[PDB]
Design an enzyme around this catalytic site. Structure first.
Site, PDB file in Angstrom:
ATOM      1  N   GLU A 165      12.627  12.878 -10.532  1.00  0.00           N
ATOM      2  CA  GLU A 165      12.626  13.039  -9.076  1.00  0.00           C
ATOM      3  C   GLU A 165      14.018  12.998  -8.455  1.00  0.00           C
ATOM      4  OE1 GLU A 165       8.633  10.548  -8.144  1.00  0.00           O
ATOM      5  OE2 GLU A 165       9.409  11.597  -6.378  1.00  0.00           O
ATOM      6  N   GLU A 365       3.335  11.019 -13.662  1.00  0.00           N
ATOM      7  CA  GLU A 365       3.129   9.702 -13.076  1.00  0.00           C
ATOM      8  C   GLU A 365       1.868   9.713 -12.217  1.00  0.00           C
ATOM      9  OE1 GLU A 365       6.425   7.640 -11.109  1.00  0.00           O
ATOM     10  OE2 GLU A 365       7.869   8.592 -12.464  1.00  0.00           O
TER      11      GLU A 365
END
Lengths: 461, 461
Positions: A165, A365
């Site tokens: 990210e 995730e």
């Protein structure tokens, strides 16, 4: 009753900074420095120095993750542990030996490694010397670090990630104060977003030059949560449009399509905040898309019109075009203040399918954090985290709707395998399938851990 | 201009805890203990220990209420004053002597006695030992207490009440922190609401076992304020639906109809929080409905949808189904935070008339509290509370319209006769027709008092 494709990968995710501890680590990353500097910014003053003790207990911790049904473990190598001289990417031999032990130990426990190169852990000296991710020189030093990783570990690791990210690094270091150095500067943020995208394409280029087997692939991990409009009122839909171009297309499009979103470039140019690129850089971005996508999802995302006009006299921020919206009637996880909306998974699966070539992808995730889990110990010592199981049931069910309609989803990685250190939140919330008593570093499977194991064997529920 | 049926009772209402003081009281009720232990929770540090000195000055206090036109007086006998041993309801001779003196002094002053058995004053020792109203043993001990009051004073008291608003005990003790023990626990509140309905039915049975004259009747004092929806969006009338079932039908239906409201029990069942009831207990409730109804009304009740879904992860409360609503443009008692809406009394009168067999009922409380009445003292130290006289005329006008539709309303009791001690608010807001200067315990009639006396002598205004 709800089944999954043949060969689906059932995994867990963490990172090095959140698990290893700083035992014998040569350099401080930005969080290390931040805790050494301002321990009051960390819950109960619990920093990264021990974390979940993975530096010392990796071999037994991997055994417990194997009991919990983790077939692939995704974690990260720390730039600040592996490298001696950042300028030359010379090697720290104790850090090299340590990553060799965990990768070998993963293999002996029948856990397929998934190695990510960077999880918010910029070395603080490179921010002091060059202002960090604002430096196209730092971009090169990171590629040199990635080079060294591929040559030392590439013989045993098939699955790689450039970044976890990058948006959180942009938002945290340069927009809202979440990460040291807590700069508040919109225009700088735009350039750091560009530089990290360029670092990733360059790493993908290097990775394939140094490839040895065809099975070796490299991807990127992003949050792709939709930006849901508050209403069909034209100011709301236009806000959701920028919110999505900015929070998702900023990285999705360079990573997968090899170019930046045209409407976004137009917008930042009009506001005079656009990054500095070169045609050769843009060509490297165009020539080296990722091989796969990791998707992180926890909670939905809704936006409404900004309160004041974007033309107002204020420092430029992406938020001048959209405001967070709370939907009357939302289903909440109240203690954590998060909306629960599992079908966002199904929308993500459809977007990758339709618009991004149905590129192979995994849920990298997904998980639920809960505080004070000692409340649900049976006196056998096992947390009765029935809430975690129901959370996974809902989201796997929505993900199944996406795979069934043709989305090329290949794996589901839970956050997290073992309770780990959640930056300034430290251990206030627990996400693990396995519980860590951080006083003794004694770890014990939770109820969900046995459930996850049976899920992998049955390949459904 | 606005006249009332013949025989209409014009009265006043208080309670033992709010008037007597604790002079030579044997036992502590929950509020006594709370004040002795956390005096900071009470306005100006003023507790119930002296209150309005009614223990010492009942005779002259009563002569003044009679001058204010109190034809009947409702108040309460304290469990913690009359009873020596709670397990057997043995008698405290001085308590018995006090209540005989009070009752006899009322009749010497030609005030009809209306005696209520319980006004938020659970003995604290019954909480410590049994958890109070959570215990069906405590419910039996209250019936023993109630039996002694009937045997001791039923020779010259015709009108009785089991409880003054049990919902305030549920709410204050078990949901919102208003009453010591300040427990916050939905499930327990459900069981306490059920237990208190059961105590009242059991008290009605005991009362008619002992009643000798046909004039003797026993009722319950409830708040029946309608739940006005915010809008007619389905989410708001769903909220108003539940708020009505929970705040009114929970007590009124058992008390008058002999059974709990079925769609309430269905939802309490679906949510896993239903009380524990036996068939014998339900048959007792079916077989002993009250004789009459006392209605307390002060301000309306407005409801809208809750902010989040009732299915969110949160502890069960009744409030997960409804949120209060502030109507733009409301008539307000600003100094107090209360809307003024007299039409509500017309709605209550019609509900009782159409849907509860038009049971004999009275307004057992209605009044207005204002702070710092020193500001309206005239030259002879009389409060000129025209605001109180106006407030009465508006609500009496609404009541009279309800009666003219035929509603069986038989009296009107103002709160209060003498300014009394309003729990944690103490003497901040005054409601009386008679002012009390609490440092010296000197009572002087307000202007509203002489107005009340003319209204009774005329049956109208």
């Amino acid at each position: 009753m709800v089944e999954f494709p043949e060969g689906f990968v059932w995994g867990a995710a963490t990172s090095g900074p959140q698990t290893e501890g700083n035992f014998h680590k040569q350099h401080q990353n930005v969080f290390d420095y931040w805790f050494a500097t301002e321990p009051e910014q960390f819950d109960a003053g619990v920093g990264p120095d021990t974390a979940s003790n993975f530096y010392n207990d990796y071999d037994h911790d991997l055994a417990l993750m194997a009991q919990a049904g983790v077939q692939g473990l995704r974690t990260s190598i720390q730039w600040t542990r592996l490298i001696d001289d950042f300028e030359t990417a010379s090697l720290n031999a104790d850090g090299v030996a340590f990553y060799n032990h965990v990768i070998d130990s993963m293999l002996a426990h029948h856990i397929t490694p998934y190695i990510n190169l960077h999880h918010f852990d910029l070395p603080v000296a490179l921010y002091d010397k060059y202002h960090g991710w604002e430096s196209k020189h730092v971009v090169e030093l990171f590629v040199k670090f990635a080079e060294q990783c591929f040559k030392l570990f590439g013989d045993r690791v098939d699955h790689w990630y450039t970044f976890n990210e990058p948006k959180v690094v942009v938002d945290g270091q340069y927009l809202y104060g979440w990460h040291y150095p807590q700069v508040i500067n919109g225009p700088k943020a735009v350039q750091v977003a560009y530089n990290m995208n360029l670092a990733s394409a360059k790493t993908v280029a290097r990775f394939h030059e140094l490839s040895v087997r065809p099975e070796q692939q490299i991807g990127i991990i992003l949050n792709l949560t939709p930006a849901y409009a508050a209403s069909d009122d034209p100011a709301d839909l236009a806000a959701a449009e920028f919110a999505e171009l900015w929070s998702n297309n900023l990285f999705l499009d360079p990573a997968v399509l090899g170019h930046f979103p045209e409407k976004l470039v137009e917008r930042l140019t009009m506001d005079g905040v656009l990054w500095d690129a070169t045609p050769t850089e843009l060509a490297i971005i165009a020539a080296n898309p990722v091989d796969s996508l990791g998707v992180n999802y926890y909670h939905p995302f809704r936006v409404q019109r900004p309160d004041i006009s974007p033309k107002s006299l204020q420092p430029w921020m992406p938020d001048i075009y959209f405001k967070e919206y709370d939907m009357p009637g939302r289903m909440m996880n109240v203690d954590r203040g998060w909306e629960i909306y599992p079908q966002a998974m199904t929308d993500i699966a459809r977007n990758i399918q339709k618009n991004y070539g149905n590129i192979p992808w995994m849920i990298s995730e997904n998980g639920m954090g809960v505080a004070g889990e000692e409340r649900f110990l049976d006196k056998q010592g096992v947390v009765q985290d029935d809430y975690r199981i129901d959370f996974m049931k809902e989201h796997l069910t929505a993900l199944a709707k996406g795979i069934a309609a043709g989305s090329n989803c290949q794996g589901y990685f839970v956050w997290s395998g073992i309770d780990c250190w959640s930056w300034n939140h430290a251990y206030h919330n627990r996400y693990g399938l396995i519980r860590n008593d951080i006083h003794t570093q004694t770890k014990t499977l939770k109820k969900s851990a046995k459930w996850f194991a049976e899920l992998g064997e049955r390949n459904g529920f």
